[PDB]
Structure 1
Amino acid sequence: CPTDWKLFDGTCYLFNPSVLHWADAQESCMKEGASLASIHSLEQYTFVKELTTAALTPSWLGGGDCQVSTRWFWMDGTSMDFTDWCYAQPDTTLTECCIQMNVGVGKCWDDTPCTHLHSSICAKT
């Protein structure tokens, strides 16, 4: 993996602390040959959480249900097979359709307006 990137089971991950809307965050990962990350297991989730500072900063992931409500997709060609919704999630209204992790005291996932500004996780093989 490149400098600042961290390796787990064959994928390289980077925390981007700069707050960006989801599209700016995706484009920033793409400039580094990456995508906003997907998550497929509790251990992948734990590894990614460990990159988000001691504060476990709220961060964009590369998922959403922005095309058809209740149909979630990742940007990396993987399927939505693991979720960690917070209590009272997911909101399926299209107005909040992007996946944000590290939300609240329980550090879990929300569907959030994509135009909100957050840090983000990039991943590339």
Structure 2
Amino acid sequence: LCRLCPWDWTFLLGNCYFFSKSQRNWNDAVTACKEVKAQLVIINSDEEQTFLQQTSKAKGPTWMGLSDLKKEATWLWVDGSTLSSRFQKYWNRGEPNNIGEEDCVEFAGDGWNDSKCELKKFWICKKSATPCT
């Protein structure tokens, strides 16, 4: 009897992803993921991005674990690592804008946006998968 992931999480390339059904601000999103020992989703491959972008686009605007709250225009994942320049292409045209008013990143349609952290949105969690011999 093999489960790679918790119930109602989706397996993808060695990790498990949870899609919220409700909506929260960016900080509470972090918390909610922390409560299940997970991280507001960090993106580390193109395939992951594509996979999340498409779900996310069918649900509505959705938070990822990317912010410039420490230092403006320096976008940091919730684990402290910097936005690799090879994901720069996933920002929508027109984005990011309102630097120092819009500090949290969301999926929106086909790409990424920056948004007011206080706004309520869907969120996604990531944590590692477990094997099956």
Deviates more, 1:34-43 or 1:69-78: 69-78
Percent of pairs identical after alignment?
A: 34
- Indicate which of 82, 85, 90 corresponds to 2:96: 90
- Indicate which of 69, 72, 79 corresponds to 2:72: 69
1:21 and 2:3 matched: no
1:61, distance to aligned residue in structure 2 (A): 0.1
Higher helix share: 2
**Aligned 8 A contact 1:38 1:78 in 2:** no
Structure-2 change in CA distance of 1:50 and 1:3 (3 Å): farther
After TM superposition, the score normalised by the length of structure 1 is 0.87
Task: Give ranges in structure 2 of 5+ residues lacking alignment.
Answer: 129-133
**Aligned 8 A contact 2:74 2:82 in 1:** no
Q: C-alpha deviations, 1:7-64, integer Å up to 9, x for none?
A: 1111110001211000111101111111100112221112223544x72421000001
> Corresponding residue for 1:48?
52
Aligned-residue Cα RMSD (Å) equals 1.7
Equivalent pairs, count: 121
1:118, distance to aligned residue in structure 2 (A): 0.2
Task: Give ranges in structure 1 of 5+ residues lacking alignment.
Answer: none
Task: Kindly name which structure, 1 or 2, has the bigger radius of gyration based on alpha carbons.
Answer: 2
2:18 and 2:125 map into 1 onto residues whose CA distance is 5
* Partner SS state of residue 66, structure 2: strand
- Indicate which of 10, 14, 17 corresponds to 1:10: 14
> Corresponding residue for 1:121?
124
After TM superposition, the score normalised by the length of structure 2 is 0.82
